[PDB]
Design an enzyme around this catalytic site. Sequence first.
Site, PDB file in Angstrom:
ATOM      1  N   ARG A  22      -0.061   4.580   2.861  1.00 10.65           N
ATOM      2  CA  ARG A  22      -0.020   4.234   4.278  1.00 10.65           C
ATOM      3  C   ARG A  22       0.412   5.385   5.176  1.00 10.65           C
ATOM      4  O   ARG A  22       0.439   5.205   6.396  1.00 10.65           O
ATOM      5  CB  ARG A  22       0.930   3.062   4.520  1.00 10.65           C
TER       6      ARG A  22
ATOM      7  N   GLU B 135      -4.985   3.854 -10.505  1.00  9.35           N
ATOM      8  CA  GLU B 135      -5.739   2.614 -10.402  1.00  9.35           C
ATOM      9  C   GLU B 135      -6.888   2.601 -11.400  1.00  9.35           C
ATOM     10  O   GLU B 135      -7.058   1.632 -12.154  1.00  9.35           O
ATOM     11  CB  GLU B 135      -6.255   2.437  -8.988  1.00  9.35           C
TER      12      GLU B 135
ATOM     13  N   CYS C 116       0.845  -1.203   0.000  1.00 11.71           N
ATOM     14  CA  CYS C 116       0.000   0.000   0.000  1.00 11.71           C
ATOM     15  C   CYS C 116       0.876   1.247   0.000  1.00 11.71           C
ATOM     16  O   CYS C 116       1.680   1.444   0.918  1.00 11.71           O
ATOM     17  CB  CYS C 116      -0.957   0.031   1.209  1.00 11.71           C
TER      18      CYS C 116
ATOM     19  N   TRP D  87      -9.321   6.108  -0.466  1.00 10.84           N
ATOM     20  CA  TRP D  87      -9.669   6.886  -1.644  1.00 10.84           C
ATOM     21  C   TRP D  87      -8.683   6.485  -2.726  1.00 10.84           C
ATOM     22  O   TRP D  87      -7.626   5.922  -2.440  1.00 10.84           O
ATOM     23  CB  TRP D  87      -9.646   8.396  -1.376  1.00 10.84           C
TER      24      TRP D  87
HETATM   25  C1  HEM Z   1      -5.673   6.645   2.132  1.00 12.21           C
HETATM   26  C2  HEM Z   1      -6.163   6.142   0.996  1.00 12.21           C
HETATM   27  C3  HEM Z   1      -5.473   4.915   0.380  1.00 12.21           C
HETATM   28  C4  HEM Z   1      -4.749   4.967  -0.739  1.00 12.21           C
HETATM   29  C5  HEM Z   1      -4.458   6.247  -1.570  1.00 12.21           C
HETATM   30  C6  HEM Z   1      -4.249   3.623  -0.999  1.00 12.21           C
HETATM   31  C7  HEM Z   1      -3.446   3.241  -2.064  1.00 12.21           C
HETATM   32  C8  HEM Z   1      -3.309   1.941  -2.500  1.00 12.21           C
HETATM   33  C9  HEM Z   1      -2.997   1.467  -3.839  1.00 12.21           C
HETATM   34  C10 HEM Z   1      -2.707   2.318  -5.113  1.00 12.21           C
HETATM   35  C11 HEM Z   1      -2.967   0.122  -3.795  1.00 12.21           C
HETATM   36  C12 HEM Z   1      -2.692  -0.828  -4.989  1.00 12.21           C
HETATM   37  C13 HEM Z   1      -4.043  -1.470  -5.336  1.00 12.21           C
HETATM   38  C14 HEM Z   1      -3.889  -2.342  -6.553  1.00 12.21           C
HETATM   39  O1  HEM Z   1      -2.894  -2.141  -7.269  1.00 12.21           O
HETATM   40  O2  HEM Z   1      -4.734  -3.229  -6.815  1.00 12.21           O
HETATM   41  C15 HEM Z   1      -3.275  -0.310  -2.442  1.00 12.21           C
HETATM   42  C16 HEM Z   1      -3.351  -1.613  -1.975  1.00 12.21           C
HETATM   43  C17 HEM Z   1      -3.601  -1.979  -0.651  1.00 12.21           C
HETATM   44  N1  HEM Z   1      -4.060  -1.143   0.342  1.00 12.21           N
HETATM   45 FE1  HEM Z   1      -3.899   0.875   0.395  1.00 12.21          FE
HETATM   46  N2  HEM Z   1      -4.750   2.786   0.004  1.00 12.21           N
HETATM   47  C18 HEM Z   1      -5.507   3.546   0.884  1.00 12.21           C
HETATM   48  C19 HEM Z   1      -6.184   3.073   2.008  1.00 12.21           C
HETATM   49  C20 HEM Z   1      -6.041   1.817   2.560  1.00 12.21           C
HETATM   50  C21 HEM Z   1      -6.726   1.300   3.732  1.00 12.21           C
HETATM   51  C22 HEM Z   1      -7.774   2.164   4.472  1.00 12.21           C
HETATM   52  C23 HEM Z   1      -6.305   0.036   3.964  1.00 12.21           C
HETATM   53  C24 HEM Z   1      -6.673  -1.001   5.055  1.00 12.21           C
HETATM   54  C25 HEM Z   1      -7.360  -0.744   6.189  1.00 12.21           C
HETATM   55  C26 HEM Z   1      -5.308  -0.259   2.936  1.00 12.21           C
HETATM   56  C27 HEM Z   1      -4.595  -1.418   2.755  1.00 12.21           C
HETATM   57  C28 HEM Z   1      -4.162  -1.873   1.526  1.00 12.21           C
HETATM   58  C29 HEM Z   1      -3.748  -3.224   1.247  1.00 12.21           C
HETATM   59  C30 HEM Z   1      -3.731  -4.359   2.304  1.00 12.21           C
HETATM   60  C31 HEM Z   1      -3.430  -3.289  -0.053  1.00 12.21           C
HETATM   61  C32 HEM Z   1      -2.897  -4.514  -0.830  1.00 12.21           C
HETATM   62  C33 HEM Z   1      -4.029  -5.503  -1.059  1.00 12.21           C
HETATM   63  C34 HEM Z   1      -3.620  -6.399  -2.197  1.00 12.21           C
HETATM   64  O3  HEM Z   1      -2.496  -6.973  -2.178  1.00 12.21           O
HETATM   65  O4  HEM Z   1      -4.434  -6.545  -3.135  1.00 12.21           O
HETATM   66  N3  HEM Z   1      -5.171   0.843   2.112  1.00 12.21           N
HETATM   67  N4  HEM Z   1      -3.470   0.834  -1.685  1.00 12.21           N
HETATM   68  C1  LIG Z   2      -5.714  -6.607  -5.863  1.00 15.40           C
HETATM   69  N1  LIG Z   2      -6.524  -5.372  -5.791  1.00 15.40           N
HETATM   70  C2  LIG Z   2      -6.659  -4.801  -4.426  1.00 15.40           C
HETATM   71  C3  LIG Z   2      -7.312  -3.439  -4.570  1.00 15.40           C
HETATM   72  C4  LIG Z   2      -8.188  -3.262  -5.641  1.00 15.40           C
HETATM   73  C5  LIG Z   2      -8.830  -2.053  -5.867  1.00 15.40           C
HETATM   74  C6  LIG Z   2      -8.594  -0.992  -5.011  1.00 15.40           C
HETATM   75  C7  LIG Z   2      -7.701  -1.146  -3.954  1.00 15.40           C
HETATM   76  C8  LIG Z   2      -7.556   0.035  -3.070  1.00 15.40           C
HETATM   77  C9  LIG Z   2      -8.018  -0.092  -1.754  1.00 15.40           C
HETATM   78  C10 LIG Z   2      -7.942   1.009  -0.920  1.00 15.40           C
HETATM   79  C11 LIG Z   2      -8.374   0.890   0.503  1.00 15.40           C
HETATM   80  C12 LIG Z   2      -7.440   2.204  -1.419  1.00 15.40           C
HETATM   81  C13 LIG Z   2      -7.026   2.295  -2.745  1.00 15.40           C
HETATM   82  N2  LIG Z   2      -6.556   3.480  -3.224  1.00 15.40           N
HETATM   83  N3  LIG Z   2      -7.117   1.215  -3.559  1.00 15.40           N
HETATM   84  C14 LIG Z   2      -7.063  -2.364  -3.708  1.00 15.40           C
END
Ligand code: HEM
Ligand SMILES: CNCc1cccc(-c2cc(C)cc(N)n2)c1
Length: 410
Positions: free
Chosen positions: A112, A286, A109, A281
């Site tokens: 974070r 994405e 992520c 958000w």
């Molecule tokens: C503040 C806003 C957030 C942004 C801008 C953000 C950004 C991102 C992005 C760009 C990805 C890649 C997703 C993909 O490529 O499919 C990601 C994955 C992920 N996010 Fe963050 N995220 C946010 C909030 C959160 C929250 C609230 C959580 C958990 C409580 C979280 C946990 C994760 C996890 C665990 C993954 C990886 C999941 C996977 O391997 O598919 N994120 N995030």
């Molecule tokens: C393998 N896809 C995981 C996945 C798929 C689609 C969106 C996310 C995502 C989730 C959160 C909390 C924030 C963000 N900006 N994107 C993650």
Amino acid sequence: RFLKVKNWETDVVLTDTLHLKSTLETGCTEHICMGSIMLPSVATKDQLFPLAKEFLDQYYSSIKRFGSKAHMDRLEEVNKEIESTSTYQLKDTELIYGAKHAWRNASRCVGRIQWSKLQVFDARDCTTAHGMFNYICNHVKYATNKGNLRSAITIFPQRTDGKHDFRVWNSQLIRYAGYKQPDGSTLGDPANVQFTEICIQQGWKAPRGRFDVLPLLLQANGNDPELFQIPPELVLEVPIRHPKFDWFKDLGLKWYGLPAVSNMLLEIGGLEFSACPFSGWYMGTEIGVRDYCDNSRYNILEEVAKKMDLDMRKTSSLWKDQALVEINIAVLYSFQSDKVTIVDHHSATESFIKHMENEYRCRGGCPADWVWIVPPMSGSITPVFFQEMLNYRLTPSFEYQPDPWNTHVW
Ligand code: HEM
Ligand SMILES: CNCc1cccc(-c2cc(C)cc(N)n2)c1
Ligand SMILES: C[C@H](O)[C@H](O)[C@H]1CNc2nc(N)[nH]c(=O)c2N1
Ligand SMILES: [Zn+2]
């Protein structure tokens, strides 16, 4: 044993010792590196107190009461409940800590920097798929906040035996439907066509368009799941226009504001929460790179480059590259002219480097997956391209889990 990661755009170095606290294995051996494999691969009481011990020890060692009797009585309390019931229950404060650190340890992520500002919804008193549907609507509404998005997670009852499991069968709470056509092609989102079939299978009444919000398939206490449609007034959607190209409106594209992953597992102190939808958000890419331009997704580069009148005979005109930049200018612009929270891949990678500093200072490390942190376009004009990252598995943590229609004793 105190390894070093360098940044090559800045010549800045930091020292990782947090990885000493790591526990789980990575897939990589001393002689093989799996850093680009997507997913490499009841719990007894003999194993469950060590995990409960480790968690609680760092949880009191966070609130500057490590080792106290308030700690020791909590350790003794969990110990004896792990004797009695064999499992145990987390305090409200232990759940909010554990959840925020699962996010904090999520090496894939990039957003974070925000890990501490997370809103935890305790749905551990939930019993029914209707109760699930209520908690999840309240999450959508709160996390959306009129477009001023706020991040949140809803934690449903933990796995107990293994059969009785709360599961959101949707991969994300809000996704567009996917129908394959009689002519072989595909309308909507191709990623969801297997899911969409299971939805119509359970009696969904598909509008059969492009951007149809799917219903929720919520499984409560291991029960067969039931279909509920989020009230559309709760689903905030952004119509995608370009700030130069008026023909871009006629592409008729839109996206939903709320990224809310529903299919992962929240491990805290050895407890497993099979249902834990979490939302933030979107980073612009994405939607504008992956959702819109993945070949097996909406695959719109074809039509965008047409309307730009691009040299499409030659691979080497970078016509693909050119239409890809305009599309992410259009995602970004549209979300911000509507006051819906979105962040661009430049400002998000910058924050992550910024976050990475504080982690190496007041924590001694930051598990990070370069393959996933680097945005899927313009990689090297963002600062994370030049940042060496150490990937390792800390806990609490988010984990993938099987799809339930491929494991449920139905
Ligand atoms: C503040 C806003 C957030 C942004 C801008 C953000 C950004 C991102 C992005 C760009 C990805 C890649 C997703 C993909 O490529 O499919 C990601 C994955 C992920 N996010 Fe963050 N995220 C946010 C909030 C959160 C929250 C609230 C959580 C958990 C409580 C979280 C946990 C994760 C996890 C665990 C993954 C990886 C999941 C996977 O391997 O598919 N994120 N995030
Ligand atoms: C393998 N896809 C995981 C996945 C798929 C689609 C969106 C996310 C995502 C989730 C959160 C909390 C924030 C963000 N900006 N994107 C993650
Ligand atoms: C094969 C490869 O590991 C796979 O394409 C990964 C690469 N990096 C990624 N990075 C992000 N952020 N999201 C992804 O889906 C992927 N996919
Ligand atoms: Zn490796």
